[PDB]
Design a protein around this ligand. Structure first.
Ligand SMILES: */C(=C\S(C)(=O)=O)[C@H](Cc1c[nH]c2ccccc12)NC(=O)[C@H](CC(C)C)NC(=O)[C@H](Cc1c[nH]c2ccccc12)NC(=O)CN1CCOCC1
Lengths: 219, 219, 217, 219, 191, 191, 186, 220, 212
């Protein structure tokens, strides 16, 4: 056995299944969708007392931003690809990239890696969070599958966040962004958080104003 | 190991070739192709919500030429598309339609190259080929997953093979469209069905009419 | 190569970790006034031309990069990094921001065989010195203070013992000389170290003259 | 032996091909029905995270339809192959593709990967269909490793065999004009019903949700 | 030189004169400018003989590839469009597509030097001798004509085009693409 | 360029000018020697541009030695000559000009003369490529007798040279005349 | 270069000139413009000699090799497709006469590659001068002896009447069963 | 193809070497006139050029390729420098090929070990031997094939820098014949040849070969 | 790629040895070389066998027989013929039989060495004519082409390899050599390059011409 170029007698591919056994080591990240806004928090793991923790969040385009949670190198490669692709898009058509066209494209890249034997499947799964008009959250399993979402949490002990998601409607209190973000920080619980929707595009409130916002879960 | 790949035995005899022939010989779609005096018949059993109206083994690859095929079906549609490609390239290059054996050089060689070259699997399909030759004599050839331009006054393919050679011999002692087609439809009965002659228009290759299926079967 | 382990870690690249443990140690410390960069120079055989072999290098004029693990794979990554982080400045004067030089080297380091080396690239580009360790795994990270080599296993604690942001680069030099002299067998001399620095002002990469390190000790 | 897509078994079976039948056997059902006044492919995907949308059915033109089962990624990619095929044919021949030739094209596409030792075969069976007054409805199901076949309606996916008792009432299934749906909703005891009928103007269409209500409210 | 075609009451009626004048000296007189790309559809051609003949063989085998890959005979519109896209890619010929199709029982496409227009309720004329007959024939035109009646229009318009155009040939060939089965016609000559 | 090849009863003779002048026919060199020996029974005399001459005789040196070693038989002249024609034809541009002459027993004498494209004349008798060729065919057409002794054939070919060289400005000094018999070879310089 | 060939009552009969020319001076007393592509099919090219020796070589071997590769006698039209396709890829006319399952076919092939089947044909400088006498006396289904004398007549006229054409003639009767060459018709 | 041994050796090349030691013996000698090279064989001695000839051992069917390549190299060098190739360079060429195959490739290495000898003027008469390994050394005398040491060591115990061809060839034959048998080689298959300046003029049916067949009258 | 054959510890290539075993396991053919000609023969029900002969015309001169895998014979014969043609285009004359035997031997060589391919499964006989003389070369799967005054290739030829010599005794004339061939070989095929260069297969009627 031992290559993704062949199926198991069960009918399963093991190699691609191992990608989730990669992703579980990664730190949890969570996302919430207000009707006109999307908020995506991460969790920046700190390797040492003197390390500054890495940022899970990125910013592929004006209103598009992402939060990969798997092995970092594949993640950065997907970012460089998705960015080069959005820019190719605008450069061709004097127009912002369709979000779903992008998701469909990156997912095409995953499958192109997870089908061919010589290229290993990615050990990462993006959680895209954006809109070309109305707010969206896509997830890409380390394969050609991708799903739209209302709310998504993934990585390490994301299990707490998952079971917690049921406790709130994704938009049980959509109307205020502060309600939204407080749902985000509850759902997840330096650590990162980022905001995108309506007038302001993608944004990363990692400011000390965020540090002020942190006490609000306990305020 | 030698069996896992298209290579010689310690005894000097190839393996995987025999296995592909088991693919054909366990395909269980028997087909009798007998030449007729100044004509030639090619018959096969056509074997839910499935359509018998769709199903066939017989297929034309030019007006003058038709090749029943048996084996792994995808390989069959592929070897047919290859056959049509072949006649089109020969006609395009030379302005003559291929003699049936000339189409068997392409069929048998393309089917051969798989045998040496270890990668791409050996061909899993086989079948007759019929067509009026430049010589007015009708020409009936065959091929094997192991390369073979063969050559016959009569032939059988599928789950039944040389089992029905001795059976065919009895018709061979009695071997016009009446006289020849009955040999074929009987040869299915001897060991609905679909019959195909080149001699409708004496050069054009067409499967015999549906209304006229029964009259031989009932005569 | 890239046959994912059932455990979920990549096999190969996780086998390749140990190569840095073969590394002789080096301690880079970003500081408010620069980046200090020390390493073992006692690696030397008695008869190799004395102190004629540098662990610490210079990717660009204002970048300096101590290396772990195999000397060869490091020589390659430094070669391509010199090429690229120079090629960045092809007509416009600005040299590549350290974070992005290092981002190049890592983004290549991802994808033969995985490199057996880790780097400790430092430099001043933004108003403030940068200190970037590159793991062989392609993971890229900005320490304030950090060490490489197998001696970094326990020597790292020593940084935690002393690292305050607020130091004259000279104070930082004392500090890194502390932590690195501790792990050496020989009493430290200029033959035991190959220290280099990039100032917050001078921003120029400069290996210390032996007279200097002989003076501080 | 079972370790290759290409190497034959000692008994000529291709176990590696054979496993794709397991994959598809476990994966989500995707019935496609045919009325005597149209065609209605449907899906029952079984994948707070979004529940609102995850369409399996997609078209290659506003008239032809696709549906699948199996790995999502591979099939989505084959849908891309079919779009590019229909559009290539439209660039060459200034007309929309006959369904038949497209079906054989995808037969060849899916078939190709089986032959290559490194290459991994697709894991998704594919329904492809069309209906016009003149172009009578036909439902070609494509099992991987070729052998696409025309059908009067085939259920595919995980539970298809237990649905075939319902589809086998294909007299009653052909009896319908627009109420075959309402029969199906009880019959099956996320979902994606559609349209290719005279009322559809023969162009493919997602079935209207307020047309979906009569079905669900029917019982 | 001349190539023409008028649809009778049902089917197409194509015509041409052969001469194949070569360098303002006749070389291969009584050739066959009209063609059998297939029984269902015939393709008049004029321009350079070499480029035309090669293109003719090429579209022929595409027509047969399409012919058997899908057992239905290829629509002649598709023969037109493939000749369109083909000659688009320099190569040079002008030509006329007539034929029978169950989709559209009688049409008459006309490909220019590069791009192709149709004339469903009209006639297609081309070549050096065309220009004489565009005006003459577009007068005599009426859509009701049967083959017995339009055979005359074809015949004569050829005769006038041939009268006063030096390139235009002697013996002429015509095909009566009948809506039904076989449509054959025999070489004939007047002056 | 000036080359000759007379044939004889039991002999063949080949000859040339020995000047390789440059532009405006200044004599940059007088010892240039176009004749070469590909084999004891095979010779080639090149002419036209001299660069293309050395390159061409060089390539023959290659491929003929290669064939003789690869196949034990010394190459027959028909092979060397047809192959030669094959060689030039691959590209006109390679020789801006060159006019090879091939000569030798095969023991029937074999005299052939290629054109620069590889057009070739397998003559039974004399042939004379060269810048002064017209004077050559002119003298040799009438001076020639069917079969002669090597010396009378020698004075003969020498009279064609002595005649032609004094009419052309580009004709050389000397004469690398080369009568030969299967068992012997007699080169001479004539002034 | 005249080259004239004409169909008789069962066999093509080709005939051609034998004198190469450099343009001013003649560069040969003789040449072979009746190459033998196969026993029952020959070509008679006119134009640059170089291109002619080339494509006739490549043709002869494409046809002889293909004949080895298949049962059928290389029926005459395949040579026409190969040649015309080669010239179409890109200066040498040809006239080829062979006999086969069809009639004694004869073809003429223009420098741009155009093909035509012909009752009788000529090419080259003498073509005009050959079209004059050839057409005047031609009749379908001549006795082959009539081919024997006529084709030599039209050749001799297309010889004497051009500066560019001259020398001895050669003629051959390509019967399907056999070619029957003669080196000097004169 | 295969990687180095854990002890530090190569499997494949050791295998092909194992193959070439099983080949029928070829031998080499230098004298004033030119190299003379013996054989146990069907020519089993081929000319590279006029001045160069090689005498092969090993899976000769694969040697056929190195003869063809060799000839392409020599003619190419003549093509490039208007000078026939010095032997040493030709050996460098072939061994450059052999090393090209043992290292990178995935192809099996050539099964051939062959002698080559010839007269570049610059360096007098030359003699060399080759290995699948790609190691070549000059020589005055050699005896590759079966009984390599057994046929060498006779010359090694009985040899000198200069002899006549007429006396030297017999001294090739003392090894070459007594090893198989005292008379057998000239009773059976055999092929000595030399370069006086060019070709290997001696032929086994040639009357000169009778002297070889007459060595015994001298031998006994 | 990967040469699927590789060396033995014992130094042999085992794979090519396998193909040798297949040829040994496959069908007989003879070659005999008369002083003034060469004859090659072989031991070759619905099947119209008339289309099928191991004999094949490479030129007007050269003819061949394989023993092993018929499709392998087909492709080798194809490349071979294309080489006789490639040569006759490269030069003005017919190929020497020895040269064609050498080129076939190289083509056979490569697959035995070049990556990813199974070595050819068959032996070859190659009777021919040249200005040198009437020829007969057998080609081994290894690339070991070899001259023969006579030869055999197919099953049970160990005992059968030693009947062929007798024609050289005093039967060097073709008509007497015929008996040596058929009686040694005791369906069937025979191709003979005679005093004339062209060769041609003897019909079964002419096979009965010598059957009496
Ligand atoms: C017909 C003349 S024409 C004006 O009617 O078309 C002949 C046809 C011909 C001549 N020889 C053969 C042999 C086989 C088949 C056909 C043959 N062709 C010619 O007369 C050429 C005139 C061209 C411009 C139409 N003549 C030539 O090409 C010259 C032949 C030649 C020159 N030196 C020779 C020595 C020995 C034998 C022949 C020759 N050569 C050239 O024109 C040089 N060209 C320059 C450009 O093209 C390639 C070489």
């Amino acid at each position: 056995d031992t290559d993704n170029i062949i199926y198991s007698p069960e009918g399963r591919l093991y190699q691609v299944e191992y990608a989730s056994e990669a992703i579980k080591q990664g730190t949890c990240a969570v996302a919430i969708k207000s009707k006109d806004y999307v908020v995506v928090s991460g969790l920046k793991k700190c390797i040492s007392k003197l390390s500054f923790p890495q940022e899970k969040i990125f910013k592929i385009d004006d209103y598009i931003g992402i939060s990969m949670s798997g092995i970092t190198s594949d993640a950065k490669v997907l970012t460089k690809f998705m960015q080069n692709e959005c820019l190719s898009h605008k450069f061709l058509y004097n127009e912002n990239i369709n979000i779903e066209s992008l998701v469909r494209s990156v997912a095409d890249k995953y499958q192109k890696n997870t089908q061919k034997s010589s290229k290993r499947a990615f050990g990462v799964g993006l959680m895209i969070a954006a809109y070309h008009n109305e707010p969206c959250i896509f997830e890409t399993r380390p394969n050609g599958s991708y799903f739209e979402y209302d709310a998504l949490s993934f990585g390490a002990r994301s299990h707490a966040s998952k079971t917690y998601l049921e406790k709130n409607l994704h938009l049980f209190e959509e109307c205020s962004l502060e309600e939204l973000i407080l749902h985000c920080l509850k759902a997840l619980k330096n650590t990162a958080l980022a905001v995108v929707g309506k007038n302001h595009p993608w944004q990363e409130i990692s400011s000390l104003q965020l540090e002020e916002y942190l006490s609000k879960v306990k305020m | 190991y030698d069996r896992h790949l298209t290579i010689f035995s310690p005894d000097g005899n190839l393996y995987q070739i025999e296995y592909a022939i088991k693919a054909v010989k366990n395909t269980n779609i028997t087909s009798v192709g007998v030449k007729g005096e100044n004509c030639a018949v090619i018959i096969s059993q056509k074997k839910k919500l499935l359509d018998y109206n769709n199903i066939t083994n017989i297929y034309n690859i030019t007006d003058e030429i038709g090749c029943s095929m048996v084996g792994m079906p995808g390989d069959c549609l592929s070897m047919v598309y290859k056959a049509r490609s072949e006649a089109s390239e020969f006609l395009y290059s030379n302005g003559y339609n291929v003699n049936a054996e000339t189409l068997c050089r392409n069929i048998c060689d393309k089917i051969q190259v798989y045998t040496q070259h270890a990668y791409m699997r050996l061909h899993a399909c086989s079948g007759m080929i019929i067509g009026i030759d430049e010589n007015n004599k009708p020409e009936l050839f065959k091929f094997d997953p192991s390369g073979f331009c063969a050559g016959y006054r009569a032939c059988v393919i599928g789950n039944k093979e040389q089992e029905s050679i001795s059976v065919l011999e009895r018709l061979l002692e009695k071997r016009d469209i009446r006289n020849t087609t009955i040999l074929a439809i009987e040869a299915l009965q001897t060991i609905e069905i679909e019959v195909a002659i080149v001699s409708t228009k004496n050069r054009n290759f067409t499967q015999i009419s549906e209304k006229e299926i029964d009259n031989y079967l009932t005569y | 190569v890239n046959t994912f382990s059932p455990e979920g870690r990549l096999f190969q690249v996780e086998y390749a970790l140990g190569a840095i443990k073969l590394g002789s140690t080096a301690v880079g410390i970003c500081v408010n006034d620069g980046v200090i960069l020390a390493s073992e120079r006692r690696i030397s055989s008695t008869l190799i031309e004395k102190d004629s072999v540098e662990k610490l290098l210079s990717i660009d004029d204002h970048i300096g990069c101590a290396m772990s693990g195999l000397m060869a794979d490091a020589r390659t990554l430094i070669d391509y990094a010199r090429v690229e982080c120079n090629h960045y400045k092809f007509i416009y004067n600005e040299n590549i921001n350290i974070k992005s030089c290092v981002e190049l080297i890592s983004e290549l380091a991802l994808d033969s065989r995985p490199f057996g080396v880790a780097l400790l690239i430092g430099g001043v580009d933004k108003n403030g010195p940068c200190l970037w360790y590159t793991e062989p795994s392609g993971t890229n990270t900005r320490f304030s203070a950090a060490s490489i080599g197998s001696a970094q296993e326990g020597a790292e604690l020593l940084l935690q013992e002393n690292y305050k942001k607020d130091m004259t680069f000279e104070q930082a030099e004392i500090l890194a000389l502390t932590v690195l002299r501790q792990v050496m067998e020989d009493k430290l001399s200029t033959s035991n170290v190959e220290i280099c620095a990039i100032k917050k002002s001078d921003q120029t990469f400069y290996k210390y003259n032996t007279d200097d390190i002989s003076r501080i000790i | 032996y079972d370790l290759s897509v290409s190497t034959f078994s000692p008994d000529g079976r291709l176990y590696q091909v054979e496993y794709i039948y397991k994959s598809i056997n476990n994966n989500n059902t995707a019935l496609c029905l045919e009325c005597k006044d149209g065609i209605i492919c449907c899906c029952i995907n079984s994948n707070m995270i979004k529940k609102n949308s995850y369409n399996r059915i997609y078209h290659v033109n506003n008239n032809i339809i696709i549906t699948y089962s199996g790995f999502d990624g591979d099939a989505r990619n084959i849908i891309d192959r079919a779009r590019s095929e229909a559009n290539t044919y439209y660039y060459n021949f200034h007309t929309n593709i006959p369904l038949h030739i497209l079906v054989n094209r995808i037969s060849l596409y899916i078939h190709a990967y089986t032959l290559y030792w490194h290459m991994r075969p697709f894991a998704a069976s594919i329904i492809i269909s069309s209906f016009n007054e003149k172009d009578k409805g036909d439902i070609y199901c494509i099992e991987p490793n070729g052998a696409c076949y025309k059908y009067s309606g085939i259920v595919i996916g995980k539970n298809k065999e237990m649905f075939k008792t319902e589809i086998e009432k294909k007299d009653y299934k052909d009896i319908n004009v627009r109420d075959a749906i309402e029969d199906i909703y009880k019959f099956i005891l996320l979902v994606n019903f559609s349209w290719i009928c005279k009322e559809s103007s023969y162009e493919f269409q997602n079935i209207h949700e307020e047309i979906l209500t009569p079905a669900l409210n029917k019982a | 030189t001349t190539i023409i075609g008028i649809i009778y009451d049902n089917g197409v009626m194509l015509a041409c004169d052969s001469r194949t004048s070569s360098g303002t000296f006749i070389s291969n007189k009584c050739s066959r400018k009209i063609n059998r790309i297939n029984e269902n559809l015939y393709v008049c051609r004029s321009g350079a003989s070499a480029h035309s003949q090669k293109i003719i063989e090429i579209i022929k085998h595409y027509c047969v590839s399409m012919k058997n890959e899908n057992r239905k005979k290829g629509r002649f519109h598709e023969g037109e469009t493939i000749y369109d896209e083909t000659t688009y890619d320099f190569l040079s010929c002008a030509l006329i597509f007539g034929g029978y199709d169950k989709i559209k029982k009688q049409q008459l496409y006309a490909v220019n030097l590069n791009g192709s227009i149709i004339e469903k309720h009209d006639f297609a004329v081309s070549g050096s001798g065309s220009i004489y007959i565009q005006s003459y024939l577009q007068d005599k035109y009426k859509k009701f004509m049967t083959k017995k009646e339009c055979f005359n229009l074809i015949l004569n318009c050829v005769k006038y085009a041939m009268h006063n155009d030096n390139s235009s040939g002697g013996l002429i060939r015509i095909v009566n693409i009948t809506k039904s089965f076989v449509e054959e016609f025999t070489v004939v000559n007047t002056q | 360029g000036c080359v000759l090849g007379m044939s004889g009863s039991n002999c063949v003779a080949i000859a040339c000018d020995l000047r390789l002048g440059a532009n405006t026919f200044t004599t940059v060199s007088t010892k240039f020697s176009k004749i070469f020996k590909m084999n004891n029974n095979v010779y080639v005399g090149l002419s036209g541009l001299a660069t293309d001459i050395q390159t061409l005789y060089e390539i023959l040196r290659y491929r003929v030695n290669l064939y003789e070693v690869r196949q034990d038989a010394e190459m027959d002249v028909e092979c060397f000559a047809n192959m030669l024609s094959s060689i030039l034809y691959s590209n006109r541009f390679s020789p801006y000009f060159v006019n090879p002459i091939v000569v030798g027993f095969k023991y029937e004498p074999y005299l052939t003369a290629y054109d620069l494209i590889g057009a070739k004349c397998e003559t039974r008798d004399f042939v004379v490529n060269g810048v002064t060729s017209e004077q050559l065919f002119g003298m040799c057409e009438s001076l020639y007798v069917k079969d002669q002794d090597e010396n009378g054939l020698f004075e003969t070919i020498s009279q064609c040279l002595l005649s032609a060289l004094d009419r052309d400005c580009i004709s050389g000094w000397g004469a690398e005349v080369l009568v030969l018999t299967p068992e012997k070879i007699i080169k001479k310089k004539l002034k | 270069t005249t080259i004239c060939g004409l169909v008789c009552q069962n066999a093509v009969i080709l005939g051609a000139d034998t004198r190469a020319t450099e343009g001013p001076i003649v560069a040969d007393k003789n040449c072979s413009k009746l190459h033998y592509i196969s026993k029952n099919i020959w070509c008679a090219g006119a134009g640059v000699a170089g291109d002619l020796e080339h494509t006739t070589l490549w043709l002869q071997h494409n046809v002889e090799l293909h004949r080895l590769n298949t049962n059928t006698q290389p029926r005459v039209s395949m040579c026409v497709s190969r040649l015309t396709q080669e010239l179409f890829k890109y200066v040498c006319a040809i006239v080829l006469g062979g006999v086969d399952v069809n009639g004694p076919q004869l073809y003429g092939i223009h420098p741009h590659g155009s093909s035509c089947l012909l009752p009788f044909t000529a090419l080259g400088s003498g073509s005009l001068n050959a079209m004059a006498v050839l057409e005047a006396k031609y009749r379908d289904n001549m006795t082959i002896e009539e081919g024997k004398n006529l084709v030599c007549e039209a050749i001799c006229a297309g010889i004497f009447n051009d500066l560019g054409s001259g020398g001895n003639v050669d003629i051959c009767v390509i019967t399907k069963d056999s070619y029957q060459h003669i080196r000097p018709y004169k | 193809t295969t990687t180095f041994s854990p002890e530090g050796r190569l499997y494949q090349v050791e295998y092909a070497l194992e193959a070439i030691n099983n080949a029928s013996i070829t031998i080499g000698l230098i004298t004033k006139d030119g190299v003379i090279l013996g054989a146990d064989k069907y020519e089993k001695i081929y000319k590279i050029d006029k001045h160069i000839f090689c005498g092969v051992a090993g899976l000769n069917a694969d040697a056929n390729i190195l003869i063809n390549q060799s000839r392409l190299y020599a003619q190419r060098y003549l093509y490039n420098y208007n000078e026939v190739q010095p032997v040493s360079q030709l050996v460098v060429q072939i061994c450059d090929i052999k090393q090209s195959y043992t290292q990178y490739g995935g192809l099996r290495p050539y099964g051939v070990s062959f002698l080559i000898g010839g007269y570049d003027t610059k360096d007098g008469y030359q003699l060399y031997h080759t290995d699948p390994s790609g190691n070549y050394s000059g020589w005055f005398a050699t005896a590759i094939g079966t009984n390599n040491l057994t046929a060498s060591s006779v010359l090694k115990q009985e040899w000198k820098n200069d002899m006549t061809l007429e006396e030297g060839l017999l001294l090739a034959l003392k090894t070459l014949a007594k090893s198989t048998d005292t008379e057998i080689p000239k009773s059976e298959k055999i092929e000595l040849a030399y370069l006086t300046n060019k070709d290997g003029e001696v032929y086994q049916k040639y009357l000169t070969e009778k002297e070889i067949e007459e060595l015994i009258k001298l031998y006994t | 790629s990967f040469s699927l054959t590789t060396f033995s510890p014992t130094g042999k290539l085992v794979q090519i040895e396998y193909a040798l075993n297949r040829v040994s396991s496959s069908s007989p053919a003879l070659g005999i070389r008369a002083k003034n000609g060469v004859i090659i023969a072989t031991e070759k029900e619905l099947i119209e066998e008339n289309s099928i002969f191991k004999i094949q015309q490479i030129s007007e001169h050269i003819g061949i027989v394989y023993a092993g895998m018929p499709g392998d014979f087909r492709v080798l014969l194809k490349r071979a013929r294309k080489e006789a043609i490639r040569y006759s285009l490269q030069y003005g004359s017919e190929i020497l039989v020895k040269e064609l035997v050498k080129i076939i031997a190289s083509i056979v060589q490569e697959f035995t060495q070049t990556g990813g391919v199974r070595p050819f499964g068959l032996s070859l006989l190659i009777c021919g004519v040249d200005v040198y003389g009437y020829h007969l070369y057998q080609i081994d799967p290894s690339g070991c082409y070899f001259n023969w005054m006579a030869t055999c290739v197919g099953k049970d030829y160990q005992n059968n390899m030693s009947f062929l010599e007798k024609r050289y005794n005093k039967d060097i004339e073709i008509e007497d050599a015929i008996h040596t061939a058929i009686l040694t070989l005791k369906n069937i095929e025979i191709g003979v390059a005679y005093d004339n260069k062209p060769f041609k297969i003897l019909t079964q009627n002419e096979i009965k011409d010598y059957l009496i």
